Amino acid sequence: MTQSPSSLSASVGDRVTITCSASVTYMYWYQQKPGKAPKLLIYDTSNLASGVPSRFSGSGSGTDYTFTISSLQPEDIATYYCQQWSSHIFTFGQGTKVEIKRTVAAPSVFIFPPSDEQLKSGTASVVCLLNNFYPREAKVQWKVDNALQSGNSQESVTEQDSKDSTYSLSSTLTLSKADYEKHKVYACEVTHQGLSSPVTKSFNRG
């Protein structure tokens, strides 16, 4: 079994098609939105589940099966899975991530100084937040007294938000209290398509 594509990007209103190859009797299609449990959209190949919009469809024969969204909506942002059935026997495809293509939107860049409570416990985390950007690609660099950092830092990004088709990103830089107190300037520097130049968000002290 293979399911393709594994990720796809399309505009609102676009028709979108996923295929899932190969001794199968029926294909089922599931939707998994961020973080929920999966939800059956298409069953016995071609049949829409209860309360599923008419813009979804399914078809297939023998080895080749298709799942179509005829007019992609932001609410359709999700990972989709085929699932073949025979034989008392259920196996799932690999997944297809479905993203909305939108206009470029620059991140709002925020910074969070370490909390007092943390500082008293012997450590110091700075948090840099990039909010509501598209597309997903960004460069985030941490700088302490102008010195580029590696690795006391982590990062993670939300899956695409259905309400505006954007992503957000959180990044943590973590030092000891002792190290934090020896330096003055704390900065995250951010590059993104929708930004007119690199934005530095910073603060002093320690």
């Binding site: 449990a37 910074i111 416990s121 909010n131 603060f203």
Partner: protein
């Protein structure tokens, strides 16, 4: 109005056993979503009598039981290994008033298979400031650090504040403990008046943390 509810997150040692329950508040299914492996079918059971049909891979290690008088289904996995770390789901199907099939799933139970010790979370405020405002909207949240294992679940205030909340996927620290962040965007004017509290629930350590998030300048 049928809903499936599962027991809480578990951490077990390799070679140990775990039992996940599924209560109902068509044959039913146990499915897992694992690291790397994707969605994996485990087996099915007749909720009316407890007859079972397992996926081959799972026949030896898994046992499915039904208690029809409480409407509770159980799945026990034995001889646990690292590959068994996964979210385990119970699920069923039915049909609506005019014959369309649908399904419904439990919320899932994360089972972590590890010999490492359980560590409850450190919860710190991400304080709203001039440096977290974008016009009209301010961001604030909470940084959850040094916990093990997953999951930590974050809710805000009374737990009915969900719009504008972003809870980031868990990351690994330099120590190999886990960290995440939850961030809420709010109208700037509300910072005056509303008190914001992140409620961090770590079921594996039987710990909840309630942290107030105060603005900073």
């Amino acid at each position: 109005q049928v809903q499936l509810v599962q027991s809480g997150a578990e951490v077990k040692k390799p070679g140990a056993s775990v039992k996940v329950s599924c209560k109902a508040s068509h044959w039913m299914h146990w499915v897992r979503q694992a690291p790397g492996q994707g969605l994996e079918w485990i087996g099915e059971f007749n909720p009316s009598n407890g007859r079972t049909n397992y996926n081959e891979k799972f026949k030896s290690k898994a046992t499915m039981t039904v208690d029809t008088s409480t409407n509770t289904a159980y799945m026990e996995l034995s001889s646990l290994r690292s590959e068994d770390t996964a979210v385990y789901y119970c699920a069923s199907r039915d049909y609506d008033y005019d014959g369309r099939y649908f399904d419904y799933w439990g919320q899932g139970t994360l089972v972590t298979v590890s010999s490492a010790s359980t560590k409850g979370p450190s919860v710190f405020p991400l304080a709203p400031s001039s440096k977290s405002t974008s016009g009209g909207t301010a961001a604030l949240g909470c940084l959850v650090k040094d916990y093990f294992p997953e999951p930590v679940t974050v809710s805000w205030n009374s737990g009915a504040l969900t719009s504008g909340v972003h809870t980031f996927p868990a990351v690994l620290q330099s120590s190999g403990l886990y960290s995440l962040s939850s961030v809420v965007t709010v109208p700037s004017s509300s910072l005056g008046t509303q008190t914001y509290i992140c409620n961090v629930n770590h079921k594996p350590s039987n710990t909840k943390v309630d942290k107030k998030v105060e603005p900073k300048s």
